[PDB]
């Protein structure tokens, strides 16, 4: 399965098994025996607009 979304820059540390915070609490929660991989890259020029 591939899940996709957009978050802040310093919220990428809550996408991991066993974390807390406004993102992992109630936006997107990863089980505690996760198996896959997590990939993330900056996208300032595409998503941020004056």
């Amino acid at each position: 399965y591939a899940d996709s979304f957009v978050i802040r820059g310093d919220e990428v540390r809550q996408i991991a098994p066993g974390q807390t915070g406004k993102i992992a609490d109630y936006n997107y929660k990863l089980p505690d025996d996760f198996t896959g991989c997590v990939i993330a890259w900056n996208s300032n020029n595409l998503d941020s607009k004056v």
């Binding site: 098994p17 066993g18 807390t20 505690d32």
Partner: protein, 45 residues
């Protein structure tokens, strides 16, 4: 009005059963030895 053999038997057993119960208040290198306080002061992982 002697019976130390039987007595010995009886005792050897009560003293070995007392140690098993006393071994429940030891952390063995955890924070505490009571399964709730460890459980209501940390999160599962």
């Amino acid at each position: 009005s002697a019976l130390g053999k039987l007595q010995d038997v009886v005792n050897q057993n009560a003293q070995a059963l007392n140690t098993l119960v006393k071994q429940l208040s030891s952390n063995f290198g955890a924070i505490s030895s009571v399964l709730n306080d460890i459980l209501s002061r940390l999160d599962p992982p």
